[PDB]
């Protein structure tokens, strides 16, 4: 009985940890996507600048 209780507690702890880790990794992926979006926006602005500089 003692061993079973220990195992059950370990399982609950690990499950909660996996839930937190999944949420955190999803949030960080969202943040990376946002920063990539900003980089792409300024890169397209610079590409337009280069297109005009082709006439420069």
């Amino acid at each position: 009985s003692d061993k079973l209780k220990e195992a059950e507690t370990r399982a609950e702890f690990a499950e909660r940890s996996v839930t937190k880790l999944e949420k955190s990794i999803d949030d960080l992926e969202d943040e990376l996507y946002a920063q990539k979006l900003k980089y792409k926006a300024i890169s397209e602005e610079l590409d337009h600048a280069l297109n005009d500089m082709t006439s420069i």
């Binding site: 507690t9 609950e12 702890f13 909660r16 940890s17 937190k20």
Partner: protein, 371 residues
């Protein structure tokens, strides 16, 4: 010869020879005189059962801890505990072994001086050294920087260290610890009908706290959930039957750590005294302290505390810094493992307070260069 790494603590005395992985003998530090009369003759009844023997005869004893909050309030009982630890749990006479006690930060001087005087006069050790309980816990993690929160059973203290240089002006010692959580749990259990009063039943409430309580990730959501469903009610069997069911007392007992207003204490929780301890440090070592926050001590073993504390500090701290909380699985014995490592070092071998030095300067030698 080998050194004895004793660690008085408050609630569990942990001892063992230097150079191992785990303490050899771990037993509660309680000394309980019998309280009833006693009618059987020749039963061999002693006058005081100490250590783990008094956790089996606790039904007819009055257990009383000799260490209240780090400080030692009853020197005769503490001497008895030390004598038991040396002679019966390790069976090594102290005349042939150096000792390395541990002491909380910001403790009264007289306590430390009396400790060294006892160790040198009564037990007559060759040499003893007293070390701050947080530096050892930093040793055990294998780091050299970081701010360690050592929430023991007597007192919770938070010592920041950088590159080996401790910052004496940033130590925040708070007297909420495991014992106050036990008392608060014993006080809120009365809301369901279970009354524990005797000093022996405090041990039962401590067992309940250890086996069932956990720290909630978000307090209000848990309070709302436990008040609607019944998926939290976990039952527990007393030492005589009559199982009890703990409802939302599960995460309300250890919540006192983050809201010390529950037990009437004014100060801020362990989530905000760490941030305050960091902010007192210099502006250039705050990133390293943020990234190397260390947990230690017994009371930091609640399931789910390493996430609640990280969430709280991330809320307080600036958004750019990375907050990382080191929570090794061997948290309880972290201080003693660090003590073993420190005692096993060759560079440390000349820092002991040799007996001839004590004979020349008296017990006040401990405050001197040999710290």
């Amino acid at each position: 010869t080998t050194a004895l790494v004793c660690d008085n603590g408050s609630g569990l005395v942990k001892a063992g020879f230097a150079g191992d992985d785990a303490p050899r003998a771990v037993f509660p530090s309680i000394v309980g005189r019998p309280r009833h009369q006693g009618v059987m003759v020749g039963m061999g009844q002693k006058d005081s059962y100490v250590g783990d023997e008094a956790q089996s005869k606790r039904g007819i004893l009055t257990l009383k801890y000799p260490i209240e909050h780090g400080i030692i309030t009853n020197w005769d009982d503490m001497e008895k505990i030390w004598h038991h630890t040396f002679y019966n749990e390790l069976r090594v006479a102290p005349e042939e072994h150096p000792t390395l006690l541990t002491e909380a930060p910001l403790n009264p001087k007289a306590n430390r001086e009396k400790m060294t005087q006892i160790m040198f006069e009564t037990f007559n050790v060759p040499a003893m050294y007293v070390a701050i309980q947080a530096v050892l816990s930093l040793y055990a993690s294998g780091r050299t920087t970081g701010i360690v929160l050592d929430s023991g059973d007597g007192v919770t203290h938070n010592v920041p260290i950088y590159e080996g240089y401790a910052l004496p002006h940033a130590i925040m010692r708070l007297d909420l610890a495991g014992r106050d959580l036990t008392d608060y749990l014993m006080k809120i259990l009365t809301e369901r009908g279970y009354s524990f009063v005797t000093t022996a039943e405090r041990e039962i409430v401590r067992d309940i706290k250890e086996k069932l309580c956990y720290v909630a990730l978000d307090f209000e959501n848990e309070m709302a959930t436990a008040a609607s469903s019944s998926s939290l009610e976990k039952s527990y069997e007393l030492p005589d039957g009559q199982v009890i069911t703990i409802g939302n007392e599960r995460f309300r007992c250890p919540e006192t750590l983050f809201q010390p207003s529950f037990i009437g204490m004014e100060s801020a929780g362990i989530h905000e005294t760490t941030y305050n301890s960091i902010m007192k440090c210099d502006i250039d070592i705050r990133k390293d302290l943020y990234a190397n926050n260390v947990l230690s001590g017994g009371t930091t073993m609640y399931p789910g505390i390493a996430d609640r504390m990280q969430k709280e500090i991330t809320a307080l701290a600036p958004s750019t810094m990375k907050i990382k909380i080191i929570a090794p699985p061997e948290r309880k014995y972290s201080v003693w493992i660090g003590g073993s490592i420190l005692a096993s070092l060759s560079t440390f071998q000349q820092m002991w307070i040799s007996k001839q030095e004590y004979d020349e300067a008296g017990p006040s030698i401990v405050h001197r260069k040999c710290f």
